[PDB]
Amino acid sequence: FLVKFVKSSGSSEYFLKALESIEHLQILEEEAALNIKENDKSLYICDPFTGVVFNHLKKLGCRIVGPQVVLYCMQSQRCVPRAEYPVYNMTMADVTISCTTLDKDVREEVHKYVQMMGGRVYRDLNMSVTHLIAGEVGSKKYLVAASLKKPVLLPSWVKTLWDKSQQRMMRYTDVNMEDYACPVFLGCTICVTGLSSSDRKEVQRLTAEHGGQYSGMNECTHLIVQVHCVPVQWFSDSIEKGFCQDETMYK
């Protein structure tokens, strides 16, 4: 396929750096790109992904990609993603995400940024998913990803990978997963009964430390006993294994 670089205003330095790396490639001035009126099924390099030019080509249905994608794939045509949406860079190439327990609109934002960073997205948790994005613990997707020890990260991981990769070229491992891991008890309100005052204080502390809420029936999500009624072994195993445990396995 042909490659048409679209010179535009507001572009980053990576656009220029992509021109210094190239005959079947055309270099279009902004005006020549504004006079396009159809979709020639060629690859268009655009930078930025804002402005009347980019939205024009996008409206026509053109295959659009950022210069970071060029610096990533270089002369490999097969390396270029093959999708109906513009890909800005390849920060998330090889990442396949699914989401769980998120607001639908946030979910679709996540999907958007992942796809724009060269990643894949599925709505179910299939065997291709490499990362689970979660807004809180406890879901079927969550427990499954835990049992397989797949990373379960917060949405911010995607956001921080977008915002940062706007300026520089990077990959998804260039951020520490641990700093964006879903806390073991995020979304949980932990309540206790029949525990020594000391153990009680321990549950309080560890709950707050692992992203949960402590409250000393409508407010509780879990009830530690000597709503989910679980033994303390559920709490300690959740902390020890690094994931909220399946409560039905601790009844």
Binding site: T100, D124, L125, N126, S139, K141
Partner: peptide, 8 residues
């Protein structure tokens, strides 16, 4: 199947 957990 390839689906381990379905969409919510």
């Amino acid at each position: 199947s390839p689906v381990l957990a379905e969409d919510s």
